[PDB]
Design a protein around this ligand. Structure first.
Ligand SMILES: [Cl-]
Lengths: 344, 336
């Protein structure tokens, strides 16, 4: 009774409004320019026209939802930062001093920090959605139970839908989590039928001479858990983490609202792969931002069939890249709304 | 009385190495893994080296759009009627063009400059008109060397005046029916490429390649001489864009490139004074066929993959957001 079932939310994800997109195409073709000369900006304006949650290409209010959680696989020595940095950096987000904070402010976007599994108590100014104090160590077992993954998907999609009802027009995703590039690489390996050696990157400056150990840990996580690559919830629960689940839920909720959601980098690619496995109709609500510098970025993007607009060599995460692409969503709508056709 | 071009160029200095070293230290100390903001960090460092800037203050931005018609229109190589240059220039004044709405969204001004439209004087447009269109580069030079040099001076002087008026970031754009043909000619000459590689089965494409080949063969420009190439196989809009780059570099201020046409102007600008290159900021990867070769010779990698080919400065407007974001990161991110 309290919340909608996952199945019910998924069934509200509609294909894009093809008739709206056709009208938008005709309008863009008639504008003061050679046909198709604004390329992917035109494509973006048409894609947004198909999203029934929007009205008149009005996208003023934007909100990047940052999902924070700790990971049991930190115990395997795959991250160089102290584990406590997840908590401190979440507090730093409240202070407004992190990279996503200043880039979101520069883009006029809100930032909503959500605790879905930090190894800490409740944090002032951080939304309490905490499933547990850190995920299970994926190298020795599952990150979480299937039911925990499903319930968190429902909770984070529900939050997103509440924000949609409250007037948010464009979502973005980010995360915070020491060692979370290890589950992300495991998910990408499983979803793309890739050997982990192809998908495992340096994350937060993991020493290149120790990268073989990070590969070994991811390989062991997949061997131990044997996730079903066709089952997005199973992959999330077995070799994912709470932040990854939360980002998938935001994508599901935005698509269910009929609204755009802007991806970030490698971590968000893993969540996007799981979201599209759960409901393929989510893909057309996704807007890529930048091409992450993570080693497995190109493999993940190829399988999503998405081409990011920004090539910034970025690898911070937090949603900082999603913030940058917000300007492009603005630009597509500004071109659609304000550009002349036959003013004289 | 006007300054000489040489006197303007003398002001162009290499980037401030110590300032860039201090910027690198500051960025490494921010609350993030070292180097994790990648090219956004190196953009903030490049801006730290530009002595015309202070405190990564980049509030005021200006895209200067150079409009001119081209004699090689006579060879039938343009995709649209010649009058489009004039009509689009008037649409700029009204603020309804692509660059206008994108610049507004980026908080940049647009300055539309007539350097050679085939028309009477146009209201709302800056009158820098050398002539009613350039010479037909297929049959002879676009302009005399003196014409190119005097327009470089005028356009650099205008840019320097805008710098003194408070503009912190420049961008360039152009309007000009048939101007991808001189652009391809310049890129071919500057990069030692056959025009087939720089011109973008069809009868029209075959003819356009032949026209570019003929322009180079007729004019035999000296590829080592950026002014000679501009004068012989360029055009007034291309000269003006080069002049904006020279003036911005002389002021020590960044200038954001647009697409294929601006790459040709940038290649000429760097032939004229190599130190200009460090003040260039690429924007998007133009979908024009010869874009990659031109960018490779400039050793620039654009940030935006938009599949755009409109021109007019529209790509420069989009990159203004990245200049803004780099400075916001540098100025506002927390440290210890
Ligand atoms: Cl090992």
């Amino acid at each position: 009774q309290g919340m909608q079932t996952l199945s019910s939310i998924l069934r509200t994800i509609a294909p894009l409004d093809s008739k709206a997109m056709a009208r938008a195409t005709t309008r863009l073709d008639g504008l003061l320019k050679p046909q198709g000369s604004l390329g992917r900006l035109e494509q973006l304006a048409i894609q947004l026209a198909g999203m029934r949650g929007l009205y008149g290409h009005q996208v003023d209010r934007k909100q990047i939802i940052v999902m924070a959680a700790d990971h049991g696989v930190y115990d395997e020595g795959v991250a160089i930062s102290p584990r406590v940095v997840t908590m401190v950096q979440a507090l730093n987000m409240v202070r407004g001093v992190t990279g996503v904070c200043v880039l979101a402010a520069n883009a006029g976007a809100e930032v909503k920090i959500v605790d879905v599994g930090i190894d800490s108590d409740t944090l002032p100014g951080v939304i309490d959605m905490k499933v547990a104090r850190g995920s299970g160590n994926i190298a020795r077992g599952a990150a979480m139970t299937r039911q925990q993954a499903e319930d968190l998907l429902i909770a984070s999609a529900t939050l997103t839908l509440q924000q949609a009802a409250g007037g948010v027009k464009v979502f973005g995703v980010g995360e915070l989590g020491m060692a979370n590039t290890t589950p992300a690489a495991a998910m990408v390996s499983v979803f793309t039928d890739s050997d982990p050696e192809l998908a495992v990157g340096i994350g937060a400056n993991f020493p290149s001479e120790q990268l073989h150990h990070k590969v070994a840990v991811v390989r062991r996580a997949i061997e131990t858990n044997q996730p079903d690559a066709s089952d997005g919830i199973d992959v999330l629960a077995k070799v994912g983490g709470f932040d990854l689940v939360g980002m998938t839920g935001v994508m599901l909720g935005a698509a269910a609202a009929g609204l755009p959601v802007v991806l970030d980098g490698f971590l968000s690619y893993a969540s996007a792969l799981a979201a599209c496995r759960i409901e393929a109709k989510v893909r057309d609500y996704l807007i890529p931002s930048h091409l992450s510098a993570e080693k497995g970025a190109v493999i993940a993007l190829n399988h999503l069939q998405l081409e990011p607009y920004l090539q910034m060599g970025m690898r911070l995460g937090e949603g900082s890249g999603a913030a940058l692409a917000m300007h492009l969503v603005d630009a597509a709508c500004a071109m659609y709304n304000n550009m002349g056709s036959l003013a004289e």
